[PDB]
From a paper:
Recently, several unexpectedly diverse compounds were reported to deplete cyclin K by linking CDK12–cyclin K to the DDB1–CUL4–RBX1 E3 ligase. Here, to investigate how chemically dissimilar small molecules trigger cyclin K degradation, we evaluated 91 candidate degraders in structural, biophysical and cellular studies and reveal all compounds acquire glue activity via simultaneous CDK12 binding and engagement of DDB1 interfacial residues, in particular Arg928. Crystallographic dissection of 28 ternary complexes demonstrated that despite considerable diversity of the molecular glues, the overall complex architecture is highly similar. The low-affinity DDB1–CDK12 interaction primes the complex, while the ligand, through filling the kinase pocket and bridging over to DDB1, drives robust association, offering a rationale for the unusually broad chemical diversity observed.
Strikingly, even an octyl chain (DS06 (5)) protruding into DDB1 supported the formation of an analogous complex, albeit with a lower affinity (EC50 = 1,162 ± 115 nM). We then probed the interactions between the DDB1 Arg928 and the solvent-exposed arene moiety of the ligand and noted that compounds featuring aliphatic chains or rings as their gluing moieties did not support high-affinity complex formation. Some compounds instead contact Arg928 via hydrogen bonding (for example, HQ461 and Z11) and hydrophobic interactions (for example, DS06). In summary, exploration of CR8 SAR around the R1 position demonstrated that surprisingly diverse gluing moieties (arenes and heteroarenes of varying size, but also aliphatic groups—albeit weakly) can engage the Arg928 side chain and therefore facilitate DDB1–CDK12 interactions.
Author numbering:
A (entry chain A): 1 to 393, 708 to 1140
B (entry chain B): 715 to 1041
C (entry chain C): 20 to 267
């Protein structure tokens, strides 16, 4: 039944991969940046990047590699989507007309296979004879790069080594060779095989296996003159080529895990390395030429250059310029200097590209009383952590508030003209027995500060041992002014106490407005936390006061204000507390039929419970009796990431598989069995990971609203920085927009020839369903961008229904008007 | 005494919530007021009275009071709604079948969340399942509805089989006419896609094999929505039914009717080459087309894969818990 | 765990029926008629012999807990057979049982079903299920007669005569309260003991222990001849009082 509409307000910003090459012309130097489902093509200049083209694809971009087959003038682009949609693409430009050619395409999914732990890997031969794909444990898939393979047909070679860490095609080999690090019970080893297109199997590889570091992570293919491979770990870097073996183990890299690599000098003399704390290193290959005229690797050296944003991908461009692709914080252009500055650094930032990073939580607040509404996000992680203030003004205006620690939850308290923000920072066990923070951050730079002195958990019979160098999270409640975003106060919670939930509200007959935090005692030994606190704070006159504390037997994953009472979820339990005249929390009633009560939302006396593995539940408070009632459950099991209530009958959910769904009350009340079934009337593959749903709109709707067909407004934040909006439609409007989608999909040419219907199909490893109850507003909003011939082709034979006129033909100009009104909801 | 079923009232249980939609009534989770034990209550509604007390429930009562095994769900008692006072006709109150409460069902564990299954976790799982099936098969009972949802798992690693609603006795001496459509299509054997109608205990073995494969991929093996499409998928893997491998296939009602696209060759070992050797041999034998050549439950327990598994070492499946809450 | 379904002959003088003023002869007659009703109805419907017996065993047990004066017997019998069909997987629609019951009962007898025969029966299912304590599984002398006969080796024709004569004795014992006094295994042996004594056969000769004169003890442990003799006496009592004679 329920009909809804989903549009993008801000496209994915997190950088998911980046390559360089000669894609647009055999002459230009290109930088291709991949954000989730989005490809950005840039041209490298002496000042920075000149953008040239951006396309969307109907799939999450998993593999992106540039290769130049023999006979081609310029590089071609290979992409594989997370649904295993593969394609080869070409850039073609005719004067002012830029388009992307689909040269070959197909889906490489296997009927049977176990998806691998280290994810899809895609590598291409140096000789461009074949494309290698590691999709499933125990299997290696080969797409031969022959001229006739326009469908990208492929075969699997049985692979004995089931648990593969990373694999790359090796340079400087007589036959196509793969070098891979694998894990078996004896540790990790490096092994090589040769790949045979004629025999369609592996043959014994060129050089000997060895046992490598236990945490060996990445494989680097070194080009001639060197040949062979370099293996990056947590503590050591090793180079293997035939019988040659080197190992450098500088103490500096042990401090932080290395995650990305990129070649600087095409000859392999220099490589870039980055680590999770954002440090950027230079890996140097010291050459020694022999009397044979041959060149051998003499030694390896590692030199620290400076600090960059935590980088998911690096790519060196030209001269001293490096592009830093960050998934957790802002991406950058940085220049590497030969001479260090006075602080010892060789790295100086050039440009900063906004990344909303992971949006852990967010709230909508009208800071200026305009009625427009502004969006305050918890964005970024670790040192890239920040708040973001977002308002419409045609682009979005975004203010950034750096925190240098991970923000977890945010909530606005108008009475105090400030925000409350939960945050965690990393300290390391130091020689004092205590801990030391790697850097100062918001919770340490607060004007005034406090620390919980709670004695509740002081009664620990069992202690917990600490080793020097281990990381710990230190959680804080931050009080932040709504005009200056100065950290006015920082409250530090107990040792090993995690802050999980935050609300601002009044309770009972108590006129004071409080900050309330739910916590969990997290010990490495415990699979599931068994201790926790609900803490009532009051922010008054620049100081946070501890008002009351209620001990609980679990983690307070979620809390919410409920008609003057406090609704909190503790592990499996959902509890309702009353606030007494003695300023203490008193339990009224409980619900125990859950696995883990991760998410809570309310409306009136109804409560929506989001569970770890049991989808969504509709609870109701029955005031006559003073307890809970089960209205209905979604017995179709799903792993929830966030939930929201749309109206008294429809409920919205987000899956850990990047899927959205809507459940409704069956409203066919004959048997209790029907009433207690929430039926999944809506299914939609979003492609993003939704952390937070939040009612509100950023548009100026205070008297400027006029009228829109869409009703309601839910914003949501995702891990890749994408912000979207969900809204409801009348049956009439859905049918019109849906019928138009089917017309647009026939007209619009997809990159990679990916069927739009396939892309939006609900998808887990176990199920694939066609989408239902959802209009892809981003497809609808593309009607305005298609050429006039295509618009009129779309409207041919299009009829309206349930209107002033029952059947009414559509013209191309009629739909341009409707779509433009739909673009005004964001 | 403990044996006087049907009299004790459901007042003795505090109802926690509804855990599932059953065949003959809703299933509830509850706590025993006196002991504190958690139980599951299958509600039996005869208020429809089209044919009175459902046979599906009658089967589960008749059989589960006979079957006692660690891997077979236990029916603890039967309790009733407050009965109408002094009237035996106006009473429309329902009966409740009291079972032990199991923490999770297998469908739930896989469909949602990444539950990790190592070789040893699968060994302990399959050994319990097949051992239970052997107990039932030695007692000459056929489950006939083996699905992932009907396999229950406590966090302790104990496995128990659950929904005996479609179970009936099997006589090898006296072949009897049976109901053709018995197992769910995803886990249905080929002979029942061709309509044997006189099925052997081997039907259950095929289902458990489909599970064995599913545990190694986390995805069901034969996902099809129509009877024919299932036979095509089964054929793409196991080979097409033909007298060469199944001499009696020609006797089945639909053999000539439901031909697959090709006469496929068996690829089971190739498309499952990533499975351990001991396991692949078990899968190959369980997923044999001819039910008279398909291994029995006893033979599976006497396999290199399960023979030496020590049941004392439960080896629970890996459950994420706190770590999974926030990625 | 499981309920005890066996009483002593002496205990039958204290059934509810007896204590409401029904005399022993009448309750025996009522049981015979109720049993023969169940037997005849299910036979007309084509029911397996186990299904008939199971209904009869429910019926005989039922009137250990209720009085014949408050529960009309032919309604009870029909209800027993209905459930017995579902238990033993030989099901019938309630409307079909009523149809057959009406064919076989006169107008007075069918009066017990009141104004709505199907209803009077379906409603009783609730009571029967609680009464039998949901012990739906029942074993019958038939299976033990065959399991034990299969282990007899000798003259094929003499053994088959023994089996058919004993089988008839089993069918006749369903009308008696023996179903309530002795486990079915004993019944199967007792009927073998009676058929042999009437056929002047010496069964031990056909056993694996031909010099073990108490041949039955290898089948049923701990059975004194007294028990077998008491059972035999009760079966032949039904034959002598009526006009019918031993099958031979
Ligand atoms: C919060 C919602 C879910 C939480 C609970 C997850 C399943 C609980 N475990 C059981 N599941 C089932 N299966 C049901 C129908 C067959 C549906 O799963 N039957 C069970 C269970 N415990 C005992 N029994 C007896 C009746 C056999």
């Amino acid at each position: 039944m329920s009909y809804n509409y989903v549009v993008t307000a801000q496209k994915p910003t997190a950088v998911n991969g980046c390559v360089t090459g000669h894609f647009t012309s055999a002459e230009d130097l290109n930088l291709l940046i991949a954000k989730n489902t989005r490809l950005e093509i840039y041209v490298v200049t002496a000042e920075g990047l000149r953008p040239v083209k951006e396309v969307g694809m109907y799939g999450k971009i998993a593999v992106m590699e540039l290769f130049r087959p023999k006979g081609e003038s310029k590089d071609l682009l290979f992409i594989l989507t997370a649904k295993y949609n593969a394609c080869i693409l070409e850039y073609k430009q005719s004067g002012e007309s830029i388009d992307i050619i689909t040269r070959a395409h197909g889906n490489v999914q296997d009927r049977i296979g176990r998806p691998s732990e280290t994810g899809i890997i895609g590598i291409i031969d140096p000789e461009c004879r074949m494309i290698g794909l590691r999709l499933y444990d125990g299997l290696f898939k080969v797409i031969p790069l022959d001229r006739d393979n326009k469908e990208l047909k492929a075969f699997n070679i049985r692979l004995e080594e089931l648990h593969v860490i990373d694999v790359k095609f090796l340079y400087g080999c007589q036959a196509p060779t793969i070098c891979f690090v694998y894990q078996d019970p004896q540790g990790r080893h490096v092994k090589t095989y040769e790949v045979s297109l004629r025999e369609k199997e592996f043959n014994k590889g060129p050089w000997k296996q060895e046992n490598v570091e236990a945490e060996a992570s990445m494989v680097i293919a070194v080009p001639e003159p060197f040949g062979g491979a370099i293996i990056i770990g947590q503590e050591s870097i090793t180079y293997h080529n035939g019988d040659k073996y080197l190992a450098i183990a500088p103490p500096i890299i042990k401090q932080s895990t290395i995650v990305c690599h990129n070649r600087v000098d095409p000859n392999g003399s220099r490589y870039l390395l980055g680590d999770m704390e954002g440090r950027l290193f230079m890996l140097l290959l010291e050459k020694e030429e022999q009397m044979d005229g041959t060149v051998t690797l003499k030694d390896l050296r590692v030199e620290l250059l400076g600090e960059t944003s935590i980088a998911e991908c690096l790519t060196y461009l030209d001269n001293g310029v490096v592009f830093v692709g960050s998934r957790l914080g802002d991406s950058q252009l940085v220049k590497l200097n030969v001479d260090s500055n006075e602080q010892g650094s060789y790295v100086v930032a050039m440009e900063t590209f906004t990344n909303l990073g992971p949006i852990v939580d967010m709230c909508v607040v009208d800071l200026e009383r305009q009625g427009q509404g502004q969006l305050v996000t918890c964005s970024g992680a670790f040192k890239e952590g920040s708040l973001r203030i977002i308002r419409n003004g045609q682009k979005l205006h975004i203010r950034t508030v750096p925190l240098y620690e991970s923000p977890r939850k945010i909530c606005y308290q108008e009475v105090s003209q400030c925000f409350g923000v939960l945050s965690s920072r990393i300290e390391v066990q130091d020689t004092s027995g205590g801990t030391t923070a790697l850097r100062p951050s918001a919770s340490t730079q607060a004007l005034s500060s406090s620390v919980s002195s709670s004695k509740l958990f002081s009664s620990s019979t069992a202690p917990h041992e600490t080793s020097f160098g281990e990381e710990v999270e230190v959680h804080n409640l931050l009080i932040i002014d709504q005009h200056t975003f100065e950290v006015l106060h920082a409250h530090q919670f107990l040792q090993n106490e995690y802050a999980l939930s935050l609300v601002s509200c009044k309770l009972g007959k108590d006129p004071n407005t409080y900050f309330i935090v739910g916590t969990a005692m997290v010990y490495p030994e415990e699979a599931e936390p068994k201790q926790g606190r609900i803490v009532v704070f009051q922010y008054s006159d620049g100081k946070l006061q501890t008002v009351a504390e209620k001990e609980v037997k679990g983690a307070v994953y979620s809390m919410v204000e409920f008609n003057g009472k406090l609704l909190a979820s503790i592990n499996s339990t959902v509890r309702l507390y009353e606030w007494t005249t003695e300023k203490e929390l008193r339990t009224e009633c409980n619900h125990y039929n859950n696995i883990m009560a991760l998410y809570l939302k309310t409306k009136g006396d109804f409560i929506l419970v989001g569970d770890l593995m049991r989808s969504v539940l509709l609870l109701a408070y029955k005031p006559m009796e003073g307890n809970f009632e089960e209205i209905a459950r979604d017995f179709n099991p799903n792993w929830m990431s966030a939930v929201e209530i749309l109206d008294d009958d429809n409920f919205l959910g987000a899956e850990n598989a990047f899927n959205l769904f809507v459940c409704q009350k069956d409203s066919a009340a004959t048997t209790d069995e029907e009433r207690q079934h929430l039926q999944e009337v809506g299914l939609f593959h979003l492609g993003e990971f939704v952390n937070v749903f939040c009612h509100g709109s950023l548009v100026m709707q205070n008297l400027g609203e006029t009228s829109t067909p869409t009703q309601g407004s839910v914003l949501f934040g995702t891990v890749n920085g994408m912000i979207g909006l969900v809204t409801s439609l009348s049956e009439s409007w859905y049918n019109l927009l849906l019928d138009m989608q089917n017309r647009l999909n026939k007209v619009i040419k997809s990159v990679g020839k990916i069927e739009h219907s396939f892309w939006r199909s609900f998808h887990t490893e176990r199920k694939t369903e066609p989408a239902t109850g959802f209009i892809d507003g981003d497809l609808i909003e593309s009607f305005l961008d298609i050429s006039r011939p295509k618009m009129q082709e779309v409207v041919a034979n299009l009829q309206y229904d349930d209107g002033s006129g029952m059947k009414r033909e559509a013209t191309a100009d009629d739909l341009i008007k409707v779509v433009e009104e739909l673009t005004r909801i964001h | 005494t403990e044996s006087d079923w049907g009299k004790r009232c459901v007042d003795k249980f505090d109802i926690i919530g509804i855990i599932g939609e059953g065949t003959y009534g809703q299933v509830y989770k509850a706590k025993d007021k006196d002991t504190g034990e958690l139980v599951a209550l299958k509600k039996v509604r005869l208020d429809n009275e089209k044919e009175g007390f459902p046979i599906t429930a009658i089967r589960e009562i008749k059989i589960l009071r006979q079957l006692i095994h660690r891997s077979v769900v236990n029916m603890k008692e039967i309790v009733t709604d407050k009965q109408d006072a002094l009237d035996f006709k106006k009473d429309k109150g329902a009966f409740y079948l009291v079972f032990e409460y199991m923490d999770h069902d297998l469908m739930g564990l896989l469909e949602s969340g990444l539950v990790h299954f190592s070789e040893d976790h699968i060994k302990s799982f399959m050994k319990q399942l097949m051992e239970g099936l052997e107990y039932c098969h030695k007692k000459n009972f056929l489950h006939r509805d083996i699905k992932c949802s009907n396999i229950l798992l406590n966090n302790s690693g104990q496995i128990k089989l659950a929904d005996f609603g479609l179970a009936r006795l099997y006589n090898s001496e006296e072949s009897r006419p049976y109901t053709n459509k018995v197992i769910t299509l995803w886990y249905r054997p080929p002979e029942l896609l061709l309509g044997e109608e006189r099925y052997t205990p081997a039907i259950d073995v095929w289902s458990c094999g489909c599970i064995l494969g599913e545990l190694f991929t986390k995805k069901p093996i034969f996902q099809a929505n129509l009877e024919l499409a299932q036979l095509e998928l089964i054929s793409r893997l196991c080979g097409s039914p033909c007298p060469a491998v199944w001499p009696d296939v020609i006797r089945l009602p639909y053999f000539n009717t439901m031909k697959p696209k090709k006469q496929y060759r068996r690829r089971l070992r190739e498309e499952f080459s990533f499975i351990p050797s001991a396991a692949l041999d078990l899968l190959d034998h369980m997923l044999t087309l001819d039910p008279s050549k398909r291994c029995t439950a006893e033979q599976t327990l006497q396999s290199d894969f399960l023979k030496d598994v020590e049941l004392s070492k439960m080896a629970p499946p890996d459950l994420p818990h706190w770590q999974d809450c926030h990625e | 765990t499981k309920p005890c379904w066996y009483w002593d002959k002496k205990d039958l003088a204290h059934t509810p029926s007896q204590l409401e003023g029904l005399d022993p002869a009448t309750e025996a007659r009522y049981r015979r008629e109720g049993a023969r009703f169940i037997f005849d109805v299910g036979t007309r419907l084509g029911l397996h012999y186990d299904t008939l017996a199971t209904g009869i065993i429910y019926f005989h047990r039922f009137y250990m807990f209720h009085s014949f004066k408050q529960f009309p017997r032919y309604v009870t019998g029909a209800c027993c057979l209905f459930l017995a069909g579902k238990v033993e997987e030989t099901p019938k629609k309630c409307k079909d049982i009523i149809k057959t019951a009406r064919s076989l009962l006169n107008d007075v007898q069918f009066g017990q079903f009141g104004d709505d025969p199907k209803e009077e029966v379906m409603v009783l299912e609730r009571i029967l299920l609680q009464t039998i304590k949901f012990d739906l599984q029942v074993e019958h002398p038939y299976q033990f007669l065959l399991k034990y006969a299969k282990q007899l080796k000798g003259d094929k024709n003499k053994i088959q005569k023994l089996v058919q004569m004993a089988w008839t004795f089993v069918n006749d014992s369903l009308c008696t309260t023996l179903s309530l006094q002795w486990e079915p295994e004993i019944i199967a042996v007792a009927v073998m003991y009676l058929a042999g004594r009437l056929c002047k056969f010496e069964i031990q000769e056909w056993t694996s222990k031909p010099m073990y004169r108490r041949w039955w003890e290898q089948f049923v442990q701990d059975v004194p001849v007294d028990v077998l003799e008491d059972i035999c006496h009760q079966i032949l009592d039904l034959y002598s009082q009526g006009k019918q004679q031993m099958p031979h």
